[PDB]
CSV table of N, CA and C and ligand atoms in Angstrom, one decimal:
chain,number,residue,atom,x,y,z
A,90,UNK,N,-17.3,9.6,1.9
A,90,UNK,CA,-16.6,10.9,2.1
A,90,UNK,C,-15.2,10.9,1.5
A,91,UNK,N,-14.8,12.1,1.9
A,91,UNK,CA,-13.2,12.0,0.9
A,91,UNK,C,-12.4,11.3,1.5
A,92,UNK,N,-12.3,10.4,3.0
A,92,UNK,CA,-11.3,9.4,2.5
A,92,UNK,C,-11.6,7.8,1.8
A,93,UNK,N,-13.4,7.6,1.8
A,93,UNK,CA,-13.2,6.8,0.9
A,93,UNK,C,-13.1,7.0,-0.5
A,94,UNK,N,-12.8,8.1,-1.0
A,94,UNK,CA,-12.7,8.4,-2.8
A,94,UNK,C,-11.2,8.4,-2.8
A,95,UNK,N,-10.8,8.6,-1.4
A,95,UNK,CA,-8.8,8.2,-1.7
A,95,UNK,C,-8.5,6.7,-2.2
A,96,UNK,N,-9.4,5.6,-0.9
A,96,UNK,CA,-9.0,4.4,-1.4
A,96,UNK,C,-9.8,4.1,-2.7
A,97,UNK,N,-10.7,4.5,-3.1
A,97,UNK,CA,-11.1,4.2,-4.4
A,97,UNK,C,-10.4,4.8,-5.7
A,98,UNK,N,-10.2,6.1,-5.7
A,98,UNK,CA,-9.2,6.8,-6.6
A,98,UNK,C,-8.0,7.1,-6.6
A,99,UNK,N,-7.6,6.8,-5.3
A,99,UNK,CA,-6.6,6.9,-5.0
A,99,UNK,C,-4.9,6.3,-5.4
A,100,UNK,N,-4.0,7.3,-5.9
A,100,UNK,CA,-3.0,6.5,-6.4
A,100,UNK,C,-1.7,6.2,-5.5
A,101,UNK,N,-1.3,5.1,-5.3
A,101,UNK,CA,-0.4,4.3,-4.5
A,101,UNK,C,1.3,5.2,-5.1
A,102,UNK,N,1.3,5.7,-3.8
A,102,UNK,CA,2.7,6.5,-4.4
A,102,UNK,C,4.2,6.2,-3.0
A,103,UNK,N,3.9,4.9,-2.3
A,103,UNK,CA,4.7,4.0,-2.0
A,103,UNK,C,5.6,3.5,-3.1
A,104,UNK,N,7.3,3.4,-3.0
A,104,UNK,CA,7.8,2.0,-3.5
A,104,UNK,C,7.5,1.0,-3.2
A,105,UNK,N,7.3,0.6,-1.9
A,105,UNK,CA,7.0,-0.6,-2.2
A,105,UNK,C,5.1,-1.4,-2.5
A,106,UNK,N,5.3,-0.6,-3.0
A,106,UNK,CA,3.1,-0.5,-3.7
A,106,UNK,C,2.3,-1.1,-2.5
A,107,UNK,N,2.3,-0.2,-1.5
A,107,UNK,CA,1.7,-1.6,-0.8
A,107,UNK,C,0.1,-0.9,0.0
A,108,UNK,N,0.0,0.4,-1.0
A,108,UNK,CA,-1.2,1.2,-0.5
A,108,UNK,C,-0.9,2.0,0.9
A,109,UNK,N,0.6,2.0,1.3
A,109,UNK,CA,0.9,2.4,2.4
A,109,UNK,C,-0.1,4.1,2.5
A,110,UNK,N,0.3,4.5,1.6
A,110,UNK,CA,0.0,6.2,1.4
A,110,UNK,C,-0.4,6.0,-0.4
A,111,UNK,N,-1.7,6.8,0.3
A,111,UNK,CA,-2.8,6.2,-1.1
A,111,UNK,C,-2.9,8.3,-1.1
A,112,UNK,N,-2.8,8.9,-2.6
A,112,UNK,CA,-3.1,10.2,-3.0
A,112,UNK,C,-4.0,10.3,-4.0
A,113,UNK,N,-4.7,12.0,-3.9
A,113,UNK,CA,-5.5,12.1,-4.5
A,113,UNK,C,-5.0,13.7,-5.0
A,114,UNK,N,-4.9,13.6,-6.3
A,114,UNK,CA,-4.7,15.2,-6.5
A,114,UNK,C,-6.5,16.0,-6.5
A,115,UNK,N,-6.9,17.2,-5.6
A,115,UNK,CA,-7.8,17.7,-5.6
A,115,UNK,C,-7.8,18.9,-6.4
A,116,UNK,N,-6.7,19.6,-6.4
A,116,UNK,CA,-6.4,20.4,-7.1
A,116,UNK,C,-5.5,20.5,-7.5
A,117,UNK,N,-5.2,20.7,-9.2
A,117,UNK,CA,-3.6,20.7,-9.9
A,117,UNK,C,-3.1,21.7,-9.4
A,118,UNK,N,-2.0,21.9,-8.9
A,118,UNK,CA,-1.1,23.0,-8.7
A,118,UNK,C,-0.1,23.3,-9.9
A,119,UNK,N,1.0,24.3,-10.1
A,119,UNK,CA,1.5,25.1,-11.1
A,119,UNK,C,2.6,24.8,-11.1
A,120,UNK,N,3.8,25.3,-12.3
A,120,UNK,CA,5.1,24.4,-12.5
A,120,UNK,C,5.3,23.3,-12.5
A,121,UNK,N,6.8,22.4,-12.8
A,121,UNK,CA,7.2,21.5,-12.7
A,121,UNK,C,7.6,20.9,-11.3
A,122,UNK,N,8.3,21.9,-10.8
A,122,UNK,CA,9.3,21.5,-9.3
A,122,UNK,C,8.5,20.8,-8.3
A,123,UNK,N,8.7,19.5,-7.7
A,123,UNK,CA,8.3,19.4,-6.5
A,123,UNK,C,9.4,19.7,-5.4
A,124,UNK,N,9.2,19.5,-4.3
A,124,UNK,CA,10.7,20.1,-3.2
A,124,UNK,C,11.7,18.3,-3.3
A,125,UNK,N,12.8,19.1,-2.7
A,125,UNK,CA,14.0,18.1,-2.1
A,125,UNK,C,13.7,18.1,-0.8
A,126,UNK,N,14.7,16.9,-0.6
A,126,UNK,CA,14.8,16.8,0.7
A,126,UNK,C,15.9,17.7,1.2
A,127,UNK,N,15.4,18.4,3.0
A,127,UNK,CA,15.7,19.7,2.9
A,127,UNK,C,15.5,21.3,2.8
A,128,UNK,N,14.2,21.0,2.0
A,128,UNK,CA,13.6,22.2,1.5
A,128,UNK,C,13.1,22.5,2.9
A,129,UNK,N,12.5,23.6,2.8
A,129,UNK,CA,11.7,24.4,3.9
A,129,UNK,C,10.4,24.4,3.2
A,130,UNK,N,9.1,23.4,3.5
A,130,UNK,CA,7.8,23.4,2.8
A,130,UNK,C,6.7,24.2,4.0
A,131,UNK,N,6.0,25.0,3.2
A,131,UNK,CA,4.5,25.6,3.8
A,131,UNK,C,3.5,24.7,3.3
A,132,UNK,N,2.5,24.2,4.3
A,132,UNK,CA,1.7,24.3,4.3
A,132,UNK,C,0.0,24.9,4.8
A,133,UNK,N,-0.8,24.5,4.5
A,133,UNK,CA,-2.2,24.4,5.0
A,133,UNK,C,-3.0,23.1,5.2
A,134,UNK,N,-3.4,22.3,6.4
A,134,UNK,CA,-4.0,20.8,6.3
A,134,UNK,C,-4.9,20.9,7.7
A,135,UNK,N,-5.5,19.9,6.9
A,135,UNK,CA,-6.4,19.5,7.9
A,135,UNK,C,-6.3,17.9,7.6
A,136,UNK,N,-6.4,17.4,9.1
A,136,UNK,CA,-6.3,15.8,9.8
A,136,UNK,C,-7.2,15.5,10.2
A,137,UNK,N,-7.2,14.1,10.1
A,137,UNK,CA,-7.9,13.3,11.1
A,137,UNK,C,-8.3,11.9,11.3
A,138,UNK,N,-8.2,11.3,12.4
A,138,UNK,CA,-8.5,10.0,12.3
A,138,UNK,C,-9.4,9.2,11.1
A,139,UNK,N,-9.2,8.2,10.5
A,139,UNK,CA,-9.9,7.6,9.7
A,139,UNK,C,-11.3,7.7,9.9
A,140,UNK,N,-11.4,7.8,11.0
A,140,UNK,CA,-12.5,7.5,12.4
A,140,UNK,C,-13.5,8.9,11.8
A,141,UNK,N,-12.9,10.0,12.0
A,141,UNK,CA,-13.4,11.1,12.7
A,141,UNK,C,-13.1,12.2,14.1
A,142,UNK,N,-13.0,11.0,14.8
A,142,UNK,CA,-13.1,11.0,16.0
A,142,UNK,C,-11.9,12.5,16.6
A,143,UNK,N,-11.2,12.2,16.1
A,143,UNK,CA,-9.6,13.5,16.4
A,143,UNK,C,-9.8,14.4,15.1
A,144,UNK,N,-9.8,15.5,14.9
A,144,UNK,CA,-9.7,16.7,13.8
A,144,UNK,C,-8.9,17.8,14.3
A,145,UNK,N,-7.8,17.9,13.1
A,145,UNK,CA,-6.4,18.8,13.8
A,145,UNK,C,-6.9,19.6,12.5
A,146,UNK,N,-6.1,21.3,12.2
A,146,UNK,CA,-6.3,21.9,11.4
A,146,UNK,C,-5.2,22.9,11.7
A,147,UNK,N,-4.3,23.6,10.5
A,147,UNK,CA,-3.8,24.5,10.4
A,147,UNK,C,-4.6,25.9,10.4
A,148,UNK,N,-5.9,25.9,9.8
A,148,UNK,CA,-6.6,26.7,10.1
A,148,UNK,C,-7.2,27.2,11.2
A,149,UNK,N,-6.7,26.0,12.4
A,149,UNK,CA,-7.4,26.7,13.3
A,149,UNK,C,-6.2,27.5,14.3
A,150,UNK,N,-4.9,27.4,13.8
A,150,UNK,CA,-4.1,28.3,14.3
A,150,UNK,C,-4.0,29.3,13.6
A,151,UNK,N,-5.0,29.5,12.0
A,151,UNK,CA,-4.9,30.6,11.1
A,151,UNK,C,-3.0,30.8,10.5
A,152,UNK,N,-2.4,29.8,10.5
A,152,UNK,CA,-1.1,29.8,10.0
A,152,UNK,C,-0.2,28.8,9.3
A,153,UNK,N,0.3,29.0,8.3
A,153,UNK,CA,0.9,27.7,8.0
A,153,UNK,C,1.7,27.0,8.9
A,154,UNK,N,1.6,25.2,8.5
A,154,UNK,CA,2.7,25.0,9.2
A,154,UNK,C,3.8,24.5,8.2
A,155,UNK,N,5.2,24.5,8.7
A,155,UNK,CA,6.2,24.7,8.3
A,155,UNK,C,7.3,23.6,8.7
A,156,UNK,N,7.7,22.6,8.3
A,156,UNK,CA,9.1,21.6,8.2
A,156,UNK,C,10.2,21.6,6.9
A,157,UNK,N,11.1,21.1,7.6
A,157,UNK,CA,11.6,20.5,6.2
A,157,UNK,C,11.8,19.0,5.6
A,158,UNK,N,11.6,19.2,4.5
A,158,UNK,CA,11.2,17.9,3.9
A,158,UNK,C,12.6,16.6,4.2
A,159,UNK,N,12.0,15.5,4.4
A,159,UNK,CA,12.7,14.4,4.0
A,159,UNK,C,13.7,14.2,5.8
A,160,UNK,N,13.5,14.4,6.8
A,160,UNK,CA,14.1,14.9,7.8
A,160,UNK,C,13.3,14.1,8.8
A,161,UNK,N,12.1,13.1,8.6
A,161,UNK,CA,11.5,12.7,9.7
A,161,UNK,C,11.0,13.7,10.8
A,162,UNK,N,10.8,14.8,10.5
A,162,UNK,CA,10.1,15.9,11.3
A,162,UNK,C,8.5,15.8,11.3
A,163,UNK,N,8.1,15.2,10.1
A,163,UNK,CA,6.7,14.5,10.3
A,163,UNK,C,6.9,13.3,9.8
A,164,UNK,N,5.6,12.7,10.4
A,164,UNK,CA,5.3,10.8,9.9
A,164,UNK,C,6.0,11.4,8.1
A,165,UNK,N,6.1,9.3,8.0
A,165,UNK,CA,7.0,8.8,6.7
A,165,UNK,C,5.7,9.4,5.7
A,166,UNK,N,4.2,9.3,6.0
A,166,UNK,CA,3.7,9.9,5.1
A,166,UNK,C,3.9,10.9,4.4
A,167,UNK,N,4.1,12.1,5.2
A,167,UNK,CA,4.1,13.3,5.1
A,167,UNK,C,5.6,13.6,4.0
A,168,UNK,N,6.3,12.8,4.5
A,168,UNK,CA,7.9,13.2,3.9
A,168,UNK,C,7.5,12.2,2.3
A,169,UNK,N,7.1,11.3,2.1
A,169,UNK,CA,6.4,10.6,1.2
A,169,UNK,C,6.1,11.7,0.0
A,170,UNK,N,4.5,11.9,0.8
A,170,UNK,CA,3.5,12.2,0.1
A,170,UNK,C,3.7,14.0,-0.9
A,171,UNK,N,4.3,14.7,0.4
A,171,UNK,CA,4.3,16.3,0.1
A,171,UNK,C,5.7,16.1,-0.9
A,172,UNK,N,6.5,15.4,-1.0
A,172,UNK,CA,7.9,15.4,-2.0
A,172,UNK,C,7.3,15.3,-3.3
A,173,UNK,N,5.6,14.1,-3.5
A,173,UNK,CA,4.9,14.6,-4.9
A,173,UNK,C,4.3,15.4,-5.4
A,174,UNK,N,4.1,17.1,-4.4
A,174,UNK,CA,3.3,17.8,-4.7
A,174,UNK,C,3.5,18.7,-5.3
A,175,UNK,N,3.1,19.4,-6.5
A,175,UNK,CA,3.6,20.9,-7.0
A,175,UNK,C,3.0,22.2,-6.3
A,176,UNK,N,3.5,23.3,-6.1
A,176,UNK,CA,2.9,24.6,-5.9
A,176,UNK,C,1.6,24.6,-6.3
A,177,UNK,N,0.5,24.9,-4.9
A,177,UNK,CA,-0.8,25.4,-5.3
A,177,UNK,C,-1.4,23.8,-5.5
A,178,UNK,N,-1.0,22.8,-5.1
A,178,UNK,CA,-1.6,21.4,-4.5
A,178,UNK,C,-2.3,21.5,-4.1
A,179,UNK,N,-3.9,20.9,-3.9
A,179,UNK,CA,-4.3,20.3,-3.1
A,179,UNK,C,-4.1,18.9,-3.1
A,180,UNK,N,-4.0,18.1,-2.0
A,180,UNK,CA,-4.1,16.4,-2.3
A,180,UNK,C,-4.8,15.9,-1.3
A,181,UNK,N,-5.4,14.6,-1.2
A,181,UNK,CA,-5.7,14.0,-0.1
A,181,UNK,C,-4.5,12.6,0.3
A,182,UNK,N,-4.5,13.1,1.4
A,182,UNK,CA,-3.6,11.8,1.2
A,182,UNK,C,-5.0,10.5,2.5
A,183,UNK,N,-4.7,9.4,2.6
A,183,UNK,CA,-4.9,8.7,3.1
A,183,UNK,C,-3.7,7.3,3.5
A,184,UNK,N,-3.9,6.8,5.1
A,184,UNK,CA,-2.3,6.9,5.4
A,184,UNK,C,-2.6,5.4,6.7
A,185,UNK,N,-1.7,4.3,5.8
A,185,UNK,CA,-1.8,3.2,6.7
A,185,UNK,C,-0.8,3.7,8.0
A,186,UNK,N,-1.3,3.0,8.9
A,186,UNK,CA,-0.5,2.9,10.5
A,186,UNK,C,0.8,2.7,10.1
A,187,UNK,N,1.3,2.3,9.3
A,187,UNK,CA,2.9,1.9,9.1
A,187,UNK,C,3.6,3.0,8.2
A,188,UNK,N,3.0,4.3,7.9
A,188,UNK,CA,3.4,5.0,7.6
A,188,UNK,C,3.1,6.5,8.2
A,189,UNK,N,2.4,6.0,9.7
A,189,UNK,CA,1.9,6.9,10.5
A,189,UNK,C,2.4,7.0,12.0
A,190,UNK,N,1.6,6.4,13.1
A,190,UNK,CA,2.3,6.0,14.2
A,190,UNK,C,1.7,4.8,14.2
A,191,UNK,N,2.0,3.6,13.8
A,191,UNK,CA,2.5,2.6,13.7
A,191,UNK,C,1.6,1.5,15.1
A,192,UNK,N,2.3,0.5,15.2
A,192,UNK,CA,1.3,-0.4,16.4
A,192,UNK,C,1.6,0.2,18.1
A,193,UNK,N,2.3,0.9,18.1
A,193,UNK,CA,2.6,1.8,19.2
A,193,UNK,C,1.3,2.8,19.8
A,194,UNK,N,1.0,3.7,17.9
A,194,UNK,CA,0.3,4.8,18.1
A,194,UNK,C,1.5,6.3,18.9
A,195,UNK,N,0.1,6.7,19.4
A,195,UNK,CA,0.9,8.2,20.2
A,195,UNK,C,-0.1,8.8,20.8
A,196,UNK,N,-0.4,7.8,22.0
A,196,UNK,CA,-1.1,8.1,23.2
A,196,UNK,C,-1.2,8.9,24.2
A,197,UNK,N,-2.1,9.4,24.2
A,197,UNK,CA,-3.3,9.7,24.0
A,197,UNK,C,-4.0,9.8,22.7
A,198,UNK,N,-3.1,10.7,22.1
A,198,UNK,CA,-4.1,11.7,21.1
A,198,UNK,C,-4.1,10.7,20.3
A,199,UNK,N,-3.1,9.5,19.4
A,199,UNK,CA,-3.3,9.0,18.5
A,199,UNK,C,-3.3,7.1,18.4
A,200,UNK,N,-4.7,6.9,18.6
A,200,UNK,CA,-4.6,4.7,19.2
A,200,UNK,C,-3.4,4.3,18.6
A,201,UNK,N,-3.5,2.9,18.5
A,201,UNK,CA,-2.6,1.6,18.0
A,201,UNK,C,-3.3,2.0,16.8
A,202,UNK,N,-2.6,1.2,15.5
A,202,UNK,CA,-2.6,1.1,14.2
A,202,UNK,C,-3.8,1.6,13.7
A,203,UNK,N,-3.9,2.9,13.8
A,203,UNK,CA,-4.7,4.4,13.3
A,203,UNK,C,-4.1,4.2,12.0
A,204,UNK,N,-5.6,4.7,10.8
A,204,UNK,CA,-5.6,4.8,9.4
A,204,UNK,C,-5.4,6.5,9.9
A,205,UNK,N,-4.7,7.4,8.8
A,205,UNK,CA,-5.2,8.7,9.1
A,205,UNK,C,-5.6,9.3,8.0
A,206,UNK,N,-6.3,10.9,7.6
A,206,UNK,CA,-6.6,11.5,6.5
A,206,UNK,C,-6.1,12.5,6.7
A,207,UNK,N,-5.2,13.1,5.7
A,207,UNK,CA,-5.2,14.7,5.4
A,207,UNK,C,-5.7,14.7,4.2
A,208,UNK,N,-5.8,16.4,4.3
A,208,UNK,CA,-6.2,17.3,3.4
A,208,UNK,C,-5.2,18.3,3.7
A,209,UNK,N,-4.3,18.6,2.4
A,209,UNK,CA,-2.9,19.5,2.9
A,209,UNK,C,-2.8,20.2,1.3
A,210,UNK,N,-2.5,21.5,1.0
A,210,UNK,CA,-2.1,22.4,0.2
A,210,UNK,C,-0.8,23.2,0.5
A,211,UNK,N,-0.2,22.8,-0.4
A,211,UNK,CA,1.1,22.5,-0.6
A,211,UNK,C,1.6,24.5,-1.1
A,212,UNK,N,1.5,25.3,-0.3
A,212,UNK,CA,1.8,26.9,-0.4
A,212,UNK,C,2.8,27.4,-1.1
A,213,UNK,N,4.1,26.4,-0.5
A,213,UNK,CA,5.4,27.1,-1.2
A,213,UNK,C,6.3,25.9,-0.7
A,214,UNK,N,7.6,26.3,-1.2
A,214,UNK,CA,8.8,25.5,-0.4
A,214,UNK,C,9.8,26.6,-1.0
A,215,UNK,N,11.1,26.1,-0.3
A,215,UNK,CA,12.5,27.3,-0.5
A,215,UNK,C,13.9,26.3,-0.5
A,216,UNK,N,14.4,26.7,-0.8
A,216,UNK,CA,15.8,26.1,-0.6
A,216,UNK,C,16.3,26.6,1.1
A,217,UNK,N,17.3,25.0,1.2
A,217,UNK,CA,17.8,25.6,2.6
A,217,UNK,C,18.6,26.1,2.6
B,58,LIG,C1,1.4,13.3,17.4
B,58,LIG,O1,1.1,14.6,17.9
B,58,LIG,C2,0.4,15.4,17.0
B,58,LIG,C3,-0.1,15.0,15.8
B,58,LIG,C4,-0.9,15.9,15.0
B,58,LIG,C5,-1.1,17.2,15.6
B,58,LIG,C6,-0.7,17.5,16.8
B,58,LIG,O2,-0.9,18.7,17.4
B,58,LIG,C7,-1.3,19.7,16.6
B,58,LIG,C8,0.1,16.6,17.6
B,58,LIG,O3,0.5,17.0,18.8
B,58,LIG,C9,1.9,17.3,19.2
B,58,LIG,C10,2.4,18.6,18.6
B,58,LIG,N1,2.7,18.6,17.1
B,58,LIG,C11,3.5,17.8,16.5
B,58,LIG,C12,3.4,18.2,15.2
B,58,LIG,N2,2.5,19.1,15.1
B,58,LIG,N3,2.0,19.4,16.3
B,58,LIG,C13,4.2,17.7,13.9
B,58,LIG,C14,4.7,16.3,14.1
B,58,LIG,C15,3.7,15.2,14.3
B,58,LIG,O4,2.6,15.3,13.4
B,58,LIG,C16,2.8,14.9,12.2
B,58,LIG,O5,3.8,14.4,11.8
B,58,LIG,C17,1.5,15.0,11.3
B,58,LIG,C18,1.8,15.7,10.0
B,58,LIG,C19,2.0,17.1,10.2
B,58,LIG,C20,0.8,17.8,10.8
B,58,LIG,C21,0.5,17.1,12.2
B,58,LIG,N4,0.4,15.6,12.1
B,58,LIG,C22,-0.4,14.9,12.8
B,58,LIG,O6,-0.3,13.6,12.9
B,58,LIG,C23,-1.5,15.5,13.7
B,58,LIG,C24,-2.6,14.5,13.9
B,58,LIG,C25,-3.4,14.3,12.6
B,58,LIG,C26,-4.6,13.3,12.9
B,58,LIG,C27,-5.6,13.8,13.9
B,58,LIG,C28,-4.8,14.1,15.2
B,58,LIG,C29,-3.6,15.0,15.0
């Protein structure tokens, strides 16, 4: 399935290479710019445990969701992963526990050292 063509094709876009946050561009998006940190980014994603088992979706609130980048407002993946994306992205990301919630987790909804998958398209971003 598509998170094993992440670890298979997937490109290591960690400093410190350590496969933390493995991406997959699904679809090229347009322009140069990716966002700063700061920015105000839209998206569209869908999650879920490595497992299966938990499936979150923006679509199922029918609305983007919305942070700003680089701010720890989502997991280190997210602030990572979406800083590589251009307008009109798709990517997959796939996402060790150490760049997720970690040996802790976030219990209930999310165990100890959970692998996780998005699928996120990357809408827009703005200056703050
Ligand atoms: C850990 O708590 C959650 C995780 C996720 C979804 C949750 O509810 C929809 C959720 O409940 C609390 C409410 N909340 C928080 C956030 N969004 N909603 C953003 C910040 C924390 O989330 C994140 O940083 C990441 C990246 C941005 C989208 C949400 N997300 C998640 O981790 C989802 C996970 C994804 C894996 C399957 C279960 C939900």
């Amino acid at each position: 399935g598509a998170p094993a063509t992440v670890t298979e094709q997937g490109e290591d876009i960690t400093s410190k290479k350590d496969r933390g946050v493995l991406k997959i561009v699904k679809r090229v998006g347009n322009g140069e710019e990716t966002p700063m940190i700061g920015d105000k980014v839209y998206v569209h994603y869908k999650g879920k445990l490595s497992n299966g088992k938990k499936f979150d979706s923006s679509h199922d609130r029918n609305e983007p969701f919305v942070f700003s980048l680089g701010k720890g407002q989502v997991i280190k993946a997210w602030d990572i992963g979406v800083a590589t994306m251009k307008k009109g992205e798709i990517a997959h990301l796939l996402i060790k526990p150490e760049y997720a919630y970690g040996s802790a987790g976030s219990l209930p909804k999310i165990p100890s050292n959970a692998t996780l998958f998005f699928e996120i398209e990357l809408l827009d971003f703005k200056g703050e």
